[PDB]
Structure 1
Amino acid sequence: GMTEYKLVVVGADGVGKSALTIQLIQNHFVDEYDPTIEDSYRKQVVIDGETCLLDILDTAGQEEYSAMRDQYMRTGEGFLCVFAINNTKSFEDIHHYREQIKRVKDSEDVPMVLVGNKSDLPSRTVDTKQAQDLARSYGIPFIETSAKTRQGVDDAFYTLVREIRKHKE
């Protein structure tokens, strides 16, 4: 049977959650995607020789801590916590997203990857060392991405699948 991995992409508005998801799905950079569209997209991929089905939830809805929103986020097996390297506030929000994931999954060990997006841009405000160190503090991997150039896109989603595999085993 083909294993399906449910991946959820989270982070502050405008960090590039949709552009990253669409690069994985379409193999195309989409600079404009309605910031309110929250949807799931599937793609069959080969990761370490195993053909698997990715189901990616690209988050966008209003901040809401209700039984309904918690249950929808709880379907995720692994999470990408995205910030933009030129937006300090998005990096400073990361701990909130991790805390909410741990809470809905009722687990101290949820497969997770820290993603520093917009790596193509020159006006960086978050040092790579600070981002590597945040990931080190949590015991999770860190991946530098650009949805514009496709830098790190497969690395981010594929590392998350590998983290899910380790957790299940």
Structure 2
Amino acid sequence: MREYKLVVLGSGGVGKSALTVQFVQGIFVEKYDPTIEDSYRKQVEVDAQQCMLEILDTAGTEMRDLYMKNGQGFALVYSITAQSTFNDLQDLREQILRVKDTDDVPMILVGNKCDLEDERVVGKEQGQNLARQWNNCAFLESSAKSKINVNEIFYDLVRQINR
């Protein structure tokens, strides 16, 4: 069983923790507890293989360089509710490319909180638009709350890492 070091990144409040905890624990985190740094472990099956995921859940408002050096795959999370969270993702992407010193980094753009369709500031099209600008990146709209596209985030990263 291969080990996969995954890192969830993005600005404060986007639902990095909510997504992770939903994926690993099948629980929806209601309260907002700003994260320092959490690590979770979960065995999954991606493409007929057992994988051990170690998932690092990072602080939004915050050792970043270290995470990027160590991580194999990066979930880049914004909230469709909050425009600045989307804006911030360009720098993270460019930092990761810098630190890893390569274009070819397993990576997914994740538009979270797709259950607050009402409060949606960021559009789905801008989402998908951003991802193509990023070397035909992967893109998902997700909800930690509704359990939509939660697992796919992580499986997609495994696949990419395996490529």
What is the TM-score of this pair, normalised by structure 1? 0.91
Q: Deviations over 1:9-59 (max 9, x none)?
A: 000100000000101110111122521331111000111221110000000
CA distance in 2, matches of 1:130, 1:69: 26
Q: Distance in 1 between matches of 2:19 and 2:60?
A: 17
Name which of 137, 141, 145 aligns with 1:144: 141
AA at the equivalent of 2:148: Q
Q: Is 1:126 aligned to 2:131, yes or no?
A: no
Change (3 A) 1:72 1:93: closer
Q: Which residue of 84, 100, 115 maps to 2:110?
A: 115
* Alignment match, 1:87: 82
Percent of aligned pairs sharing the same letter: 58
TM-score, length basis structure 2 = 0.94
Cα distance between partner residues in 1 of 2:2 and 2:90: 30
Partner residue in 1 for 2:3: 4
> Is contact 1:29–1:148 with CA below 8 Å preserved after alignment?
yes
55 and 33 in structure 1: CA distance in 2 versus 1, 3 angstrom threshold? farther
Do the aligned partners of 2:4 and 2:52 also contact (CA within 8 Å) in 1? Answer: yes
After superposition, where does 1:21-60 map in structure 2 within 5 Å?
21-60=20-59
2:9 corresponds to 1:13? no
The amino acid across from 2:28 in the alignment is F
Gaps of 5+ in 2: none
CA distance in structure 2 between the aligned counterparts of 1:127 and 1:72, rounded to whole angstroms? 29
Distance (Å, rounded) in 2 between the aligned partners of 1:30 and 1:95: 27
Mind listing any 5+ residue stretches in structure 1 that lack a counterpart? none
Deviation at 1:156, TM superposition (A): 0.9
Runs of 4+ in 1 over 2 A off after TM superposition: none
Coordinate RMSD, CA, aligned: 1.3
